[PDB]
Every structure is written in C-alpha cells, then in structure tokens.
Curated annotation (Swiss-Prot):
The lineage of its organism: Bacteria, Bacillati, Bacillota, Bacilli, Lactobacillales. The gene is vanS. It comes from the Bacteria. Autophosphorylated. The chain holds residues 228 to 375 of 384 of the full protein. It is found in: Membrane. Residues 1-131 are annotated as: Involved in low-affinity ATP-binding. Exhibits higher affinity for ATP than GTP. This is Sensor protein VanS. Induction: Up-regulated by vancomycin. Residues 1-131 form the Histidine kinase domain. Member of the two-component regulatory system VanS/VanR. Functions as a sensor protein kinase which is autophosphorylated at a histidine residue in response to environmental stimuli, such as glycopeptide antibiotics. VanS transfers its phosphate group to transcriptional regulatory protein VanR, thereby modulating expression of target genes. Binds directly to, and autophosphorylation activity is enhanced by, the glycopeptides vancomycin and teicoplanin, in vitro.
Length: 131
C-alpha cells in the first residue's frame, strides 16, 4: 500500500481554492508527480489539510503558498511556506488551528513536523519515512 502524494496535495489544493482566491492568494505544488509514501491515507490527508488551514490563515493577501514535496535519503519532506508571520506565542503553542492531532498522526507514522516563523515568511515541514 502507498499514497500518491502529488495527487493528494492537488486534491487538497482544489478544496482550498475558493478560500484562497477570495483573498487573491494561490497555492502552488512543487513535487515529482512520481512521489509516493506509505501510511494511513485519510489520516495524512487530514495532516496536510490542517497545515494548509494554518498557512491560509496567516498568509498575506495576494501572496503564494508554496508546497514543496520531495524525496531525499530515507525521508519524504513536504514543506509549506507562506508570506506572513505567526505570533511567537501562537507559534510556541501550535503543538480551530491546533496541530496537536496532526503532530501525533505524524508521530505515529514515525515522522516529525517542524514549524518556524520569522517576520517575513512561515515554514511548516512534514517529514515521513520513505518506502
């Protein structure tokens, strides 16, 4: 069993399109269409939906949300980068936008989630074991 990760991210992107276009924002996926990971598909989809919800809420009007997914070594990484900042106290609490469930789902998959924010842009990074 496996997840065709590019088409999972695309279907999520299409669900967020009205929300994003209302503010002139855009999500763009950068990934090998060939990329795959193992895991619970409906659970991983909730992880990515929950992350994009945070990226949408803290992203500036008229900006792009970059979702970069790739394979490097033993790890498949999915990185969400947006323009805009999370308040440092809201960021230090992140683990309707709570990511504690997304984190344990990722933890149960043997992976990790990282969240960073400087005053220009915000990065969410999911790492998962490659097959």
């Amino acid at each position: 069993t496996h997840i065709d990760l590019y088409y999972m991210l695309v279907q999520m992107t299409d669900e967020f399109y009205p929300q994003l276009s209302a503010h002139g924002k855009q999500a763009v996926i950068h990934a090998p269409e060939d990329l795959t990971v193992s895991g619970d598909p409906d659970k991983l989809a909730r992880v990515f939906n929950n992350i994009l919800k945070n990226a949408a809420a803290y992203s500036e009007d008229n900006s792009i949300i970059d979702i970069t997914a790739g394979l490097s070594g033993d790890v498949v990484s999915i990185e969400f980068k947006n323009t805009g900042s999370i308040p440092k106290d809201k960021l230090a609490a992140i683990f309707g936008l709570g990511l504690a469930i997304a984190k344990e789902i990722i933890v149960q998959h043997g992976g990790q989630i990282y969240a960073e924010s400087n005053d220009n842009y915000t990065t969410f990074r999911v790492e998962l074991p490659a097959m």
